[PDB]
Amino acid sequence: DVAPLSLGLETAGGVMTALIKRNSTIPTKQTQIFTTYSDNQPGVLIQVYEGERAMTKDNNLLGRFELSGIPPAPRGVPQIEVTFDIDANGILNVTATDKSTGKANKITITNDLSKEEIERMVQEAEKYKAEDEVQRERVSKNALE
């Protein structure tokens, strides 16, 4: 019925950027436009995370993929459309497409975590809320490494 945890990707500096917020009613689909962190960046690394903490290392890793072929351009210029789609079949599709060329890549994640363990991740997130927000402020926008 609901996404029991926030679902997102890692932005510059190991920052958790949520696309599907905790308690979102399923089916659900969200999209954010992302960019490159450094000049002439040839591609982006999509790292799929679950959890509430501000830094991805403290959340759970679900999968990875790279979208390469990004032409040389300055930082913050390329447009990378990243969509998270949760279906009613227990299939999570994460797609990243380069808006300039149409070049894309994707990962499929299925549901095959305990209720208490889910309850702990949200407990831990509000306990570490301040420390997490400090690291976020210090290290962060919509930039992808």
Ligand X SMILES: *[C@@H]1CC[C@]2(C)[C@H]3CC=C(C=C)[C@H](C)[C@@H]3C[C@@H](O)[C@@]2(O)[C@@]1(C)C(=O)O
Residues of this chain that bind ligand X (CB under 6 A): 3-5, 50, 62, 86-87, 90-92, 109-111, 113, 118
Nearer to ligand X, 52 or 98 (CB): 52
Do strands 143-144 and 28-36 pair parallel, antiparallel, or not at all (unpaired)? parallel
Q: How far is the CB of 73 from ligand X (least distance, A)?
A: 33
Nearer to ligand X, 38 or 108 (CB): 108
Nearer to ligand X, 25 or 110 (CB): 110
Q: How far is the CB of 34 from ligand X (least distance, A)?
A: 20
Q: How far is the CB of 122 from ligand X (least distance, A)?
A: 11
Q: How far is the CB of 113 from ligand X (least distance, A)?
A: 3
* Helix (H/G/I), strand (E/B), else coil: 123: helix
| Residue 52 structure tokens | 């509430």
DSSP assignment of 36-66, as one string?
ESSTT--EEEEEEEESSSSBGGGSEEEEEEE
Nearer to ligand X, 104 or 118 (CB): 118
How many other C-beta atoms lie within 10 A of the C-beta of residue 139?
Answer: 13
| Residue 50 structure tokens | 């679950």
Q: Rounded to an integer, what is the distance from CA 11 to the centroid of its chain? A: 7
